[PDB]
Design a protein around this nucleic acid. Structure first.
Lengths: 293, 170, 56, 205, 159
RNA sequence: GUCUACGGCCAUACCACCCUGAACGCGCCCGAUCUCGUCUGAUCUCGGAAGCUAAGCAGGGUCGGGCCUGGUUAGUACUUGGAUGGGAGACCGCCUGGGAAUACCGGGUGCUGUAGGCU
RNA sequence: GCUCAGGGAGGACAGAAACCUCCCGUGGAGCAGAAGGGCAAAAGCUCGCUUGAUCUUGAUUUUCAGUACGAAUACAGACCGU
RNA sequence: UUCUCAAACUUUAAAUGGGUAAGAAGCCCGGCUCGCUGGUGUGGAGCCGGGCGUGGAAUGCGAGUGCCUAGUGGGCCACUUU
C-alpha cells in the first residue's frame, strides 16, 4: 500500500489543458505565433494555409482566425483528385502537390485572380516566387500551418506548400525542406524535387518490386493493378491532373437528400429513469436476501 | 472467435550489461551485444555519484540494446533456452511485461574468448498489442484503455502458450 | 534626540483645500508618443489634402 | 520562574505560530490532549460536558496542563481510570515572546520565544469529558475543579450531543438503527445517500 | 521604510486565478483596440513583457496609440494632491474592453430611436433616467388566512 | 441525427471503470525503394490498403470521485456610520445600513463557429 | 525534439541506493543566487545554428519634486541571427 | 474519519473602499487624402461638407487661469484599526 496520487484532493487542484491540447490536435504555442495579427493592422485578416496529411487523405485549408473560431475561406481535399484523373495514390508527395495546386487556383477563382498570377504551369521544381503585379490586385499571401508534423526534408506538408506556391499563392518558404535538398554540401537539385511532384519515387518502387517478386508487388500496389496505373503512365497522368485542376478549379458541393432523420445514438437517460434504477437495484438486492434467508 | 486485433506480441527485447565500470571492461562488453544482436548498442551514462559502487556523475556504467520484430523473437528463443524454458511467478511485471537474466553470455551462441571475458546480461520482454503505438506519438496520443491492456495473468498464459514455459512459484 | 519619522496626517486636508483637480481635459490631444511609421503616413495624408480639393 | 499570566492574558498580537520564521520555541507542558479510556466505543459514553470560554483571552499551555490533571485526578478517584474520556480541545499554537533586561533599554526590543499559549474565543470549548449518563454531577464537579487553573470566566455546559460527536443524543439511536451511522473509534461515520451503490451494499448485507 | 521596487505587494495582484494558470486563451490577442477605446488594466502574470505598474492594475483609461503587440493608454493615477492623466505602454494580455461605456451607448441608440420615433407621433417620452422612485400605493391581498404570528424564540447555548 | 479538418470559451468538457458504434471519415494496421531519422522504420519521415473496431475516438451508463450551479449554513460570522450604551477590564449589547465561507442537501455532466462529408 | 520530482511492479552480479524496462505522475522538479509571482508538445531537459549583450533617434514607465542616475516598457530607422 | 491552528498559508470571501461611464469633444450618413497596411474604394487614421438639441441620472454650486510670495519643514491628542 502506497499514497494514491489521484484522491479527491488531486482533482480539486487539477487544471485541465485546452480541449484541442487534451485531444492532441493543436500546439497552442505554435498556433499563437502563426495566427495573431499586429494590433496596428486592425481586422486585416492574417491567412494561414493549413496542410494536414492524414492516413487516407491530405486536407489543405486556408483560414483566418476571428474571435468566434477561425473562418475557413477555401478547403482542398485529396478525395477530390479522382475528378481530375488521380484514381488512387491520394496520400503521396505527388497527390500533396495536386491538393495544394487545387487549393491555389480554387481560391484565385473566387477572388477573380484567375487570369492573373498563373505561376509555374510547367512544374520545374525550382524556388519560384509569386511576385505581385503593379496595377493588379496584389498576390494572395498566406503562411504554411504544418500542425504537429516533424518538418524534415521531404515532409508532404511542403508538397502541398509547393503545390500552392506554383498555383499563385505568395507563401514565404525555403527549399531546405523540399526532397532533393543535398544536406551534405547545402545544394538543392530541383530535378529530384521534379521526380517527387511527378511521382517517380513511387514509380521506381513499382519497378523495383516488378522484377524481384510478383507476389509482394500485388500486396504493396494492389489498387494500382486494379485502377490500371502503370509506372510509365505516372508522369503524364499527373499532367492530366495539373491541366484539369488549373482549367476547372471550382468546387461543386454534393446536394443533400431527403433523409429519414432516424437516431443511431442512445439518448441521455433522464433523471426519473436514473432515480428509478437505484430504487430497482436496492429492491432487487434486499428481496434476493430474504428469499435466500 | 476472439478478435485478431488482441494479438498479444513482443514489441522489444531490452538487453543491457551494467558492469559498474568505464574504459576497457565496458567497451569490450559493447562487442558482446553486437555479436549477440548484430546492431551498435548504446552506452548508458550514470544518474549521479555513488562512491560505494565505484560510479561517478556522467560515467558510462552500462551498455543497453533494443531489438525489434524478426530478430528479438529469435534472441529470446536463444535466451529462454539458457533458462531451460522456465520462469517464476515473481519474474512477470504487473504492467504485463516479463524479464529474466543469464549469468554468462557463452550459453547464447558466442564461444569463450580469452581476451574479451564473460558478461552476464538482462532479458526483458516488453509484451505489446496492435494499438500500443497510440501512447508514444507526436500527433493525437492517448492511453490504450483498460480492456486492451496486458495483465500479469495474461503474459504468463501467453509465454506458456508460445514457448511451453513451465511457470513455477517462488 | 529621535524625531517622528513619517506621517500622512494633515495631507488629505491640504490636498482638498484648493481641490484634487482633474487634469486640463482639453480636446484635440497631442500626438507625441504615437508611433512614427503611422504618424509619418498621417503627416503625408495631411500634406496632400491640396491634391483632392477640387473633387472635394 | 516564568512571568505571571496577567502579562500574556489578552489576545494582543496577530497569531504567531512555531514556524519556519519563529524557530527557538521550547516544548509546551501539555502533550496529552486526551486521556482516560480514549480507546472506547461511541455507545458507552453518551453524556458530554464542555468547559466553554465566556471571555476572549489566552490560556497558557501550563494552565491547560494544570487543568488537564486537576479534572483527571478527580475523575479517576470519582469514576475510575476507565469510566470517562477527557479531551483538551485547545492546542497552544500561539508562541509568547519575552524581553529580558539581564545596558540595552528598548533598543532592538523584539522578544525571544518564552513559551506557548492557546488563543481562545467566546463560546469556544476548552475541555470536553465523555462519560456514562450516570456521572452527570462528576463532570460538572471535575470541570469546576479545573476552572480555577485558568484566568477569566469559564462556563460548564452539558452538551445535547452523543459523546464527542456533532449529532444530537435524542436522534443518535435511530441514525445508527437505520445504518446512517457506523461506530469508528471515539467517533462515528456519517454515511450519506450519495456514494457508489457498492458502498450501500456492504452496509445492508 | 518599505523595500522599494517595481513588483512589491504584487504576490496576489499579478498572480493567476485558481485553475486558470497555463496557456493564455487566444481571444485575448485577436480582439482589435481602436483609438479612444475605454480599456481597463489587469496585469496578467504569465506574460512579464509590457506589464502595467501595480498602481494602474484595476484602473480604466482610453487607448491613444496602437503598436504591434501593445496599446498606449491614457490613465488617471493621482499623485499626492492632484490627478495626472498619464500614458503607459501596456501589452494586449493585461487589458480588456471596459463595458462601463456600453450601458451609455445602448441607451444613446435607444434614446435616438425613442426620439426619431415620436418625432412625428407626438407622444412625449421619458429619456432621462428617473432614479428609483418612492413606490406608489398598492393593495396587499391576504387570501383569507391571517398573517402568520412571529414571536422571538427563547435562549439556549449551542456548543 | 452524427463524424472530419481548423477553431472560440477552456472539466457542465476532467478522471476510473463498463456498454454500444450504422455509413462515412478517423484510426489502429501493412511496408522500408525513395525522402527522412534512429541502438531498433517503436518514434519520426516516406510508400501503401490484406485485415480489424480490439484500442484511440464518439454516444451512453455509474444512489461514482471531481467540476458546475443552487438551497442550507444564516441575516449567523464579520462590517460602515452612531451613543455621556453596559462592563474594573477582556469584551458585549443596541441603533443604522451592508452581509459571508465549509460541513450538510438537491440539480446539471460541454455549448458552439467556419468548411467539408456520411446517414 | 523532449518531460520533471516522486512512487509502483519487473530484471545476471545488484543490495535501502548503479543501468534497463513498463506504468502512474498538475509540476509535488527544474529555471545561477534571496524570496515571491510565472512557466509542461515550456520559460525546464537534450542537441543544432549563432552574437539582438550590435548601431541609432526620440516617447514612456519606475523612485519622483513629477529632477537625475539606475532599471524597465512600447516603438521607429538600420544591419543581422534563427 | 477526527481534535486544533497560521502576519510572512489558502479553494472561497465580504463591509468600507479605488478607477471608469452617464453625450454636440455626442450621434449619423456622404465624399476626399495617405509614401502606413493590403486578396480586395482592404484595414486604419486624417480631413472637408452635411444632418439631427427632450442638453439625455439625483443634489448643490458660477467658474477658468497666470504671476509674485511669506511663514513652516521639533508637533501633539482622541474614536477606530495597528
Amino acid at each position: 500500500f502506497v499514497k494514491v496520487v489521484k484522491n479527491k484532493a488531486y482533482f480539486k487542484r487539477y487544471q485541465v489543458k485546452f480541449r484541442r491540447r487534451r485531444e492532441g490536435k493543436t500546439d497552442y504555442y505554435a498556433r499563437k505565433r502563426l495566427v495573431i495579427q499586429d494590433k496596428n493592422k486592425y481586422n486585416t485578416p492574417k491567412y494561414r494555409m493549413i496542410v494536414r496529411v492524414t492516413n487516407r487523405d491530405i486536407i489543405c485549408q486556408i483560414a483566418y482566425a476571428r474571435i468566434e473560431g477561425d473562418m475557413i475561406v477555401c478547403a482542398a481535399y485529396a478525395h477530390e483528385l479522382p475528378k481530375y484523373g488521380v484514381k488512387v495514390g491520394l496520400t503521396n508527395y505527388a497527390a500533396a502537390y495536386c491538393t495544394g495546386l487545387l487549393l491555389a487556383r480554387r481560391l484565385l477563382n473566387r477572388f477573380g485572380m484567375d487570369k492573373i498570377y498563373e505561376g509555374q504551369v510547367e512544374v520545374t521544381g525550382d524556388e519560384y516566387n509569386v511576385e505581385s503585379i503593379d496595377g493588379q490586385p496584389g498576390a494572395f499571401t498566406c503562411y504554411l500551418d504544418a500542425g504537429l508534423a516533424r518538418t524534415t526534408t521531404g515532409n508532404k506538408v511542403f508538397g502541398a506548400l509547393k503545390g500552392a506556391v506554383d498555383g499563385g499563392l505568395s507563401i514565404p518558404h525555403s527549399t531546405k525542406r523540399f526532397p532533393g535538398y543535398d544536406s551534405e554540401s547545402k545544394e538543392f537539385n530541383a530535378e529530384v524535387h521534379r521526380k517527387h511532384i511527378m511521382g517517380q519515387n513511387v514509380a521506381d518502387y513499382m519497378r523495383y518490386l516488378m522484377e524481384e517478386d510478383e507476389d509482394a508487388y500485388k500486396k504493396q500496389f494492389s489498387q494500382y493493378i486494379k485502377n490500371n496505373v502503370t509506372p510509365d503512365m505516372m508522369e503524364e497522368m499527373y499532367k492530366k491532373a495539373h491541366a484539369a485542376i488549373r482549367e476547372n478549379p471550382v468546387y461543386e458541393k454534393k446536394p443533400k437528400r431527403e433523409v429519414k432523420k432516424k437516431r443511431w445514438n442512445r439518448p441521455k437517460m433522464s433523471l426519473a429513469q436514473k432515480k428509478d434504477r437505484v430504487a430497482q437495484k436496492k429492491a432487487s438486492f434486499l428481496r434476493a436476501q430474504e428469499r435466500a434467508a | 472467435k476472439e478478435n485478431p486485433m488482441r494479438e498479444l506480441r513482443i514489441r522489444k527485447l531490452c538487453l543491457n550489461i551494467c558492469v559498474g565500470e568505464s574504459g576497457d571492461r565496458l567497451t569490450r562488453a559493447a562487442k558482446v551485444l553486437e555479436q549477440l544482436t548484430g546492431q551498435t548498442p548504446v552506452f548508458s551514462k550514470a544518474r549521479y555519484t555513488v562512491r560505494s559502487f565505484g560510479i561517478r556523475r556522467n560515467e558510462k556504467i552500462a551498455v543497453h540494446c533494443t531489438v525489434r520484430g524478426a530478430k528479438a523473437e529469435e534472441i529470446l528463443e536463444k535466451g529462454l533456452k539458457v533458462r531451460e524454458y522456465e520462469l517464476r511467478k515473481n519474474n512477470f511485471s504487473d504492467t504485463g511485461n516479463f524479464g529474466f537474466g543469464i549469468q554468462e553470455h557463452i550459453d547464447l551462441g558466442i564461444k569463450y574468448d580469452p581476451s574479451i571475458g564473460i558478461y552476464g546480461l538482462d532479458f526483458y520482454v516488453v509484451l505489446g498489442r496492435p494499438g500500443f503505438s497510440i501512447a508514444d506519438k507526436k500527433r493525437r496520443t492517448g492511453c490504450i484503455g483498460a480492456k486492451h491492456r496486458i495483465s500479469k495473468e495474461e503474459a504468463m498464459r501467453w509465454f506458456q502458450q508460445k514457448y511451453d514455459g513451465i511457470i513455477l512459484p517462488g | 534626540a529621535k524625531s517622528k519619522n513619517h506621517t500622512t496626517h494633515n495631507q488629505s486636508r491640504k490636498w482638498h483645500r484648493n481641490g484634487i483637480k482633474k487634469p486640463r481635459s482639453q480636446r484635440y490631444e497631442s500626438l507625441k508618443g504615437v508611433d512614427p511609421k503611422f504618424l509619418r503616413n498621417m503627416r503625408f495624408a495631411k500634406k496632400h489634402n491640396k491634391k483632392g480639393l477640387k473633387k472635394m | 520562574g516564568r512571568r505571571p499570566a496577567r502579562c500574556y492574558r489578552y489576545c494582543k498580537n496577530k497569531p504567531y505560530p512555531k514556524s519556519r520564521f519563529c524557530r527557538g520555541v521550547p516544548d509546551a507542558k501539555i502533550r496529552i490532549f486526551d486521556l482516560g479510556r480514549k480507546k472506547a466505543k461511541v455507545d458507552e459514553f453518551p453524556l458530554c460536558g464542555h468547559m466553554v470560554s465566556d471571555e476572549y483571552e489566552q490560556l497558557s499551555s501550563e494552565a491547560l496542563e494544570a487543568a488537564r490533571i486537576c479534572a483527571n485526578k478527580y475523575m479517576v478517584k470519582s469514576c475510575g481510570k476507565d469510566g470517562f474520556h477527557i479531551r483538551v480541545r485547545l492546542h497552544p499554537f500561539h508562541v509568547i515572546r519575552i524581553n529580558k533586561m539581564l545596558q540595552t533599554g528598548m533598543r532592538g526590543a523584539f522578544g525571544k520565544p518564552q513559551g506557548t499559549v492557546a488563543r481562545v474565543h467566546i463560546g469556544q470549548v476548552i475541555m470536553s469529558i465523555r462519560t456514562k449518563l450516570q456521572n452527570k454531577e462528576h463532570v460538572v464537579e471535575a470541570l469546576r475543579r479545573a476552572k480555577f487553573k485558568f484566568p477569566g470566566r469559564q462556563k460548564i455546559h452539558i452538551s445535547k450531543k452523543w459523546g464527542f460527536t456533532k449529532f444530537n443524543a435524542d436522534e443518535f439511536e435511530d441514525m445508527v438503527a437505520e445504518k446512517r451511522l457506523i461506530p469508528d473509534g471515539c467517533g462515528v461515520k456519517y454515511i450519506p445517500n450519495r456514494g457508489p451503490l457498492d458502498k450501500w451494499r456492504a452496509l445492508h448485507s | 521604510t518599505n523595500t522599494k521596487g517595481k513588483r512589491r505587494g504584487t504576490r496576489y495582484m499579478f498572480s493567476r486565478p485558481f485553475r486558470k494558470h497555463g496557456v493564455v486563451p487566444l481571444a485575448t490577442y485577436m480582439r482589435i483596440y481602436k483609438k479612444g477605446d475605454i480599456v481597463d488594466i489587469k496585469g496578467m502574470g504569465t506574460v512579464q513583457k509590457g506589464m502595467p505598474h501595480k498602481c494602474y492594475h484595476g484602473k480604466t483609461g482610453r487607448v491613444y496609440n496602437v503598436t504591434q503587440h501593445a496599446v498606449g493608454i491614457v490613465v488617471n493615477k493621482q499623485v499626492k494632491g492632484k490627478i495626472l492623466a498619464k500614458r503607459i505602454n501596456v501589452r494586449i494580455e493585461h487589458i480588456k474592453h471596459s463595458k462601463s461605456r456600453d450601458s451609455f451607448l445602448k441607451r444613446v441608440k435607444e434614446n435616438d430611436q425613442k426620439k426619431k420615433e415620436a418625432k412625428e407621433k407626438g407622444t412625449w417620452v421619458q429619456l432621462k433616467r428617473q432614479p428609483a422612485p418612492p413606490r406608489e400605493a398598492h393593495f396587499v391581498r391576504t387570501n383569507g388566512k391571517e398573517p402568520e404570528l412571529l414571536e422571538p424564540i427563547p435562549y439556549e447555548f449551542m456548543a
